[PDB]
Amino acid sequence: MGEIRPTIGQQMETGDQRFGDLVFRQLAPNVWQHTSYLDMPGFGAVASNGLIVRDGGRVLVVDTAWTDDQTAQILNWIKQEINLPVALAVVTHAHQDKMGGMDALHAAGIATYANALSNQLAPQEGMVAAQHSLTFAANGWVEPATAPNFGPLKVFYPGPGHTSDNITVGIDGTDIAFGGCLIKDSKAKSLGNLGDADTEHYAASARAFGAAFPKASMIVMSHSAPDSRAAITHTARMADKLR
Amino acid sequence: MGEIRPTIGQQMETGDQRFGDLVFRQLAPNVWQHTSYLDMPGFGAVASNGLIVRDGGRVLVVDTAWTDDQTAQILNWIKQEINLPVALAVVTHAHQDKMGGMDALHAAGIATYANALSNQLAPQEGMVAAQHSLTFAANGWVEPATAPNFGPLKVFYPGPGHTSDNITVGIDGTDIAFGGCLIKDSKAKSLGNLGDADTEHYAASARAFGAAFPKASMIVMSHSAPDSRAAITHTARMADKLR
Ligand SMILES: CC1(C)S[C@H]([C@H](NC(=O)[C@H](N)c2ccccc2)C(=O)O)N[C@H]1C(=O)O
Ligand SMILES: CC1(C)S[C@H]([C@H](NC(=O)[C@H](N)c2ccccc2)C(=O)O)N[C@H]1C(=O)O
Ligand SMILES: [Cl-]
Ligand SMILES: [Zn+2]
Ligand SMILES: [Zn+2]
Ligand SMILES: [Zn+2]
Ligand SMILES: [Zn+2]
């Protein structure tokens, strides 16, 4: 009873934990997926997924929820279920699904990180910029000095795709990588919103993500349930059709 | 060059005809799918599909476009490219994607038909009601006296599903059946907007549609490309998980 059934996004499944207006799903002993819903009048809810990672003695969050209130709820769930400090949050680009609740993280005193470009785009996108800017080498790997204390979070800029600023994250010592809005599931009919997409480079960016995290057998993404690596292949092949 | 790439909906394929803001795809010698697009700010375009059917010296339309202007463009295209008059339109329920262009039909002097219930709901939905009401037998088939001169349009009310009023249409003399917004594609991760849905009866209504048109191999639907019968059965499996 009382199930959120989104118009866009995966439906609730056995194992999912309802907490307020959000859903949490444990993916590994120290990794959970957060799911928040934006209700659009006349259309219904759009689900958006991120990650919560317990690494040693702290929690690391990948992506905010759509709103400040939802993101405050994520922090309350973390406090309740895990009860370790949230050391940092990383956001995967400057769109509402990934960065809409930044004020809730800052209110909580949590150090926030995004691609420098995401921070530069934030004002234009109506997002609040993160505190800190990540920069990247020519091979796409984050410059370690800009990602202090990230631990198992390996951050990779795969090239422009869904947006110019999109980044991805692998979780060292797990079989999980996070593709955000760049990677769609292996059964997806479309690449979602292409309004900011780099149609020429998307395919290579998708394949670069797969090459960056060869250990990841569980691919987590923003608007589908976790999938196999066929998500990457299928995303790239869809993207091949754009060029 | 200059393709519409919707966020929700089929992509452009070889053979598609771009005409202003619309796309037409021939599905059979005497059947075309019309596609119109609604821009959702921040989300991108949402495709909606209906049908154009040639029956001898006249054309029959299933569903309006999202808007009056788009719907006027469909009528221009029928007039200019098919060169036959529209005898009537049948609209498949009282939402914008299916009925948002009613006034353009009426201004063109075209007789319109909808489920009586659709006409009753239309003003509550800000839609213009069709000029004529269809009624249905206890087994779902349209009452012939309410659908005069429908030629090959075989109208079936499958039961409440996507909405209480949703209707479906088979094309006699073809292997095509139209499920409107009731049926989702064979690989859909969701049933779309369930806000007005009858979650108890959806699965049986989807199966009723399949059973009404048991030989139809091409299943046309509102927001994806024409699919196999697995669209019907997958839709019913997804609906089974609502109950
Ligand atoms: C799910 C989307 C089609 S919408 C989302 C993003 N858009 C937003 O966060 C918008 N603020 C939004 C507006 C209206 C409804 C939903 C989202 C984008 O444009 O990439 N990510 C897209 C995607 O991941 O393909
Ligand atoms: C594509 C949709 C998810 S939206 C559409 C319909 N919604 C409308 O026509 C609304 N007027 C609308 C409002 C905002 C944005 C888009 C559509 C509905 O509620 O069934 N059909 C839905 C569906 O077929 O599942
Ligand atoms: Cl319920
Ligand atoms: Zn985005
Ligand atoms: Zn997204
Ligand atoms: Zn509808
Ligand atoms: Zn629809």
Curated annotation (Swiss-Prot), chains A, B:
Q: What does this protein need as cofactor?
A: Zn(2+)
Residues bound to Zn(2+) 1: 93, 95, 162
Report the enzyme's class at the first EC level. Answer: hydrolase
Q: Name one GO molecular function term.
A: zinc ion binding
Name the keywords, alphabetized.
Antibiotic resistance, Hydrolase, Metal-binding, Periplasm, Plasmid, Signal, Zinc
Asked if the keyword Secreted belongs to this entry, the reply reads: no
Highest taxon of the source?
Bacteria
Gene Ontology biological process terms in this record: antibiotic catabolic process; response to antibiotic
Q: How is its activity regulated?
A: Inhibits by captopril, thiorphan, dimercaprol and tiopronin. This enzyme is not susceptible to inactivation by the beta-lactamase-blocking agents clavulanic acid.
The entry marks the following residues as binding Zn(2+) 2, namely 97, 181, 223
The cofactor remark states: Binds 2 Zn(2+) ions per subunit.
Q: Which residues bind substrate?
A: 184, 193
Reactions mediated catalytically:
a beta-lactam + H2O = a substituted beta-amino acid
Q: Where in the cell is it found?
A: Periplasm
**Recorded GO CC terms:** periplasmic space
Family indicated by similarity:
Belongs to the metallo-beta-lactamase superfamily. Class-B beta-lactamase family.
Q: How does it assemble?
A: Monomer.
Question: Which PANTHER family has this protein been placed in?
Answer: ACYL-COENZYME A THIOESTERASE MBLAC2, METALLO-BETA-LACTAMASE DOMAIN-CONTAINING
Which additional comment does the entry carry?
Answer: Enterobacteriaceae carrying this gene (identified by PCR) have been isolated in Sweden, India, Pakistan, Bangladesh, England, Scotland, Northern Ireland, Australia and the USA. The organisms they were identified in were K.pneumoniae, Enterobacter cloacae, E.coli, Proteus spp, Citrobacter freundii, Morganella morganii, Providencia spp and Klebsille oxytoca. In India most isolates were from community-acquired infections rather than hospital-acquired infections, indicating the gene is widespread in the environment.
This protein's name:
Metallo-beta-lactamase type 2
